[PDB]
Design an enzyme around this catalytic site. Structure first.
Site, PDB file in Angstrom:
ATOM      1  N   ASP A  35       8.665 -16.498  17.067  1.00 29.24           N
ATOM      2  CA  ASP A  35       7.948 -17.764  17.150  1.00 29.24           C
ATOM      3  C   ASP A  35       6.996 -17.953  15.972  1.00 29.24           C
ATOM      4  O   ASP A  35       5.885 -17.428  15.989  1.00 29.24           O
ATOM      5  CB  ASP A  35       7.170 -17.788  18.475  1.00 29.24           C
ATOM      6  CG  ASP A  35       6.415 -19.085  18.695  1.00 29.24           C
ATOM      7  OD1 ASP A  35       6.701 -20.056  17.968  1.00 29.24           O
ATOM      8  OD2 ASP A  35       5.549 -19.136  19.604  1.00 29.24           O
ATOM      9  N   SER A 199       6.292 -32.970   4.668  1.00 26.33           N
ATOM     10  CA  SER A 199       7.578 -33.536   4.293  1.00 26.33           C
ATOM     11  C   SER A 199       7.363 -34.823   3.507  1.00 26.33           C
ATOM     12  O   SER A 199       6.402 -35.542   3.730  1.00 26.33           O
ATOM     13  CB  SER A 199       8.406 -33.799   5.553  1.00 26.33           C
ATOM     14  OG  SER A 199       9.596 -34.499   5.266  1.00 26.33           O
TER      15      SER A 199
HETATM   16  C1  47P Z   1       9.838 -19.610  25.674  1.00 28.30           C
HETATM   17  C2  47P Z   1       8.704 -20.595  25.904  1.00 28.30           C
HETATM   18  C3  47P Z   1       8.290 -21.397  24.674  1.00 28.30           C
HETATM   19  C4  47P Z   1       6.869 -21.847  24.514  1.00 28.30           C
HETATM   20  C5  47P Z   1       7.417 -20.777  23.629  1.00 28.30           C
HETATM   21  N1  47P Z   1       9.052 -21.570  27.013  1.00 28.30           N
HETATM   22  C6  47P Z   1       8.805 -20.961  28.352  1.00 28.30           C
HETATM   23  C7  47P Z   1      10.457 -22.088  26.900  1.00 28.30           C
HETATM   24  C8  47P Z   1      10.780 -23.191  27.891  1.00 28.30           C
HETATM   25  N2  47P Z   1      11.331 -22.848  29.016  1.00 28.30           N
HETATM   26  C9  47P Z   1      11.704 -23.868  29.880  1.00 28.30           C
HETATM   27  C10 47P Z   1      12.331 -23.530  31.079  1.00 28.30           C
HETATM   28  C11 47P Z   1      12.735 -24.525  31.954  1.00 28.30           C
HETATM   29  C12 47P Z   1      12.519 -25.852  31.652  1.00 28.30           C
HETATM   30  C13 47P Z   1      11.897 -26.209  30.470  1.00 28.30           C
HETATM   31  C14 47P Z   1      11.489 -25.220  29.577  1.00 28.30           C
HETATM   32  C15 47P Z   1      10.843 -25.572  28.301  1.00 28.30           C
HETATM   33  O1  47P Z   1      10.610 -26.726  27.950  1.00 28.30           O
HETATM   34  N3  47P Z   1      10.511 -24.506  27.498  1.00 28.30           N
END
Ligand code: 47P
Ligand code: 47P
Ligand code: 47P
Length: 330
Positions: A35, A199
């Site tokens: 990330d 950009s």
């Molecule tokens: C890995 C982490 C990101 C912030 C770094 N999040 C948790 C990813 C993420 N997971 C989801 C799971 C279910 C529905 C929506 C989402 C979503 O919008 N993002």
């Protein structure tokens, strides 16, 4: 030294990418979400609340002969999507693609939010933004890249994300076979702790290029491309039936559409995102409404060049004394 690791989409939509990381002695391999928009290396662990673990691989520091508790240190983070995690801290040996850092802060989760629990494929995050964003208290910790930097052949890492396919994170070298043409470098501001750049504009499909400065961050941990409402409206206006849906939470479009490409400027260079990269599929199983990959940043406070944009390029994160960002077509 150098390292090279393959990164793999977690699902058929490229919602995120996971990269194997070796932690501890003997090695415990966890699949982490690299990330560039955050600066904590945190993992699911033997300390994570049991009801909040559902299929993830965990780090067990008591089984690592090189793990040491970083006494008194705690961490707590919240991300742009509203997810969060927190816990305590160990130092241990961490290796990525053959590149080893000793004494890396490995932040062990005691608590994770529901989105993390529900993502069985992501065992934690490896932050690659600037260490000034690291959340460890009372002694802020360095990222894996910052710790590795002095040992690297060159103080850089590169992101080469695939479209519906694996890609590569390299540390310490630029693979000149991985891109076409030349790499265009552009200035970075570290004032907010991000890989923040400007950009030079955009085009929609075969349309004329609009010269306009768009300040934003290169963020491998964000799935989509978030841009000003003006730009996003101009894009979706070229797709019959597309509209912003407050109930869905952004722009949707008929799944029967063929999407136009989107071009962004990097200095005098241009990176073209093919239309197909902007399709995130049915909003729910069986729906004929599809979720768009370009969305407004209006409610975010920053523009974000997430995976949709970055996967169209070979991207150099240059961590020299004055950092810069490079983009090439591929
Ligand atoms: C890995 C982490 C990101 C912030 C770094 N999040 C948790 C990813 C993420 N997971 C989801 C799971 C279910 C529905 C929506 C989402 C979503 O919008 N993002
Ligand atoms: C939607 N978005 C995500 C973003 C990142 C990681 C996972 C997800 C997901 O499952 N659903
Ligand atoms: C800046 C205004 N703070 C809000 C904010 N910052 C982020 C930084 C990186 C990635 C995502 C986000 C986000 O969604 N919101």
């Amino acid at each position: 030294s150098t390292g090279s690791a393959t990164t793999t989409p977690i699902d058929s939509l490229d919602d995120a990418y996971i990269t194997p990381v070796q932690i501890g002695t003997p090695a415990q391999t966890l699949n982490l979400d690299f990330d560039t928009g955050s600066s904590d290396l945190w993992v699911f662990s033997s300390e994570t609340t049991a009801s909040e673990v559902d299929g993830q691989t965990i780090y067990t520091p008591s089984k690592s002969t090189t793990a040491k508790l970083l006494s008194g240190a705690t961490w707590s983070i919240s991300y742009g999507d509203g997810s969060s995690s927190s816990g305590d801290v160990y130092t241990d040996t961490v290796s990525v693609g053959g590149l080893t850092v000793t004494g890396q802060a490995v932040e062990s989760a005691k608590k994770v939010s529901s989105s993390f629990t529900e993502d069985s494929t992501i065992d934690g995050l490896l932050g690659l933004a600037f260490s000034t964003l690291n959340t460890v208290s009372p002694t802020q910790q360095k990222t894996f890249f910052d710790n590795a930097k002095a040992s690297l052949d060159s103080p850089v890492f590169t992101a080469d994300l695939g479209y519906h396919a694996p890609g590569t994170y390299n540390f310490g070298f630029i693979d000149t076979t991985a891109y076409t043409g030349s790499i265009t470098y552009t200035a970075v501001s570290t004032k907010q702790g991000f890989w923040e750049w400007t950009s030079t504009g955009y085009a929609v499909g075969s349309g004329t290029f609009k010269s306009t400065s768009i300040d934003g961050i290169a963020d491998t941990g964000t799935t989509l491309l978030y841009l000003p409402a003006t730009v996003v409206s101009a894009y979706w206006a070229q797709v019959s039936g597309a509209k912003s849906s407050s109930s869905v939470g952004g722009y949707v479009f008929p799944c029967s559409a063929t999407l136009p490409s989107f071009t962004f400027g990097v200095g005098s260079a241009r990176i073209v995102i093919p239309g197909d990269y902007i399709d995130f599929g049915p909003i729910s199983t069986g729906s004929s409404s599809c979720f768009g990959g370009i969305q407004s940043s209006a409610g975010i406070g920053i523009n974000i060049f997430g995976d949709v944009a970055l996967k169209a390029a070979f991207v150099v994160f240059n961590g020299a004394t004055t950092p810069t960002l490079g983009f090439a077509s591929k």
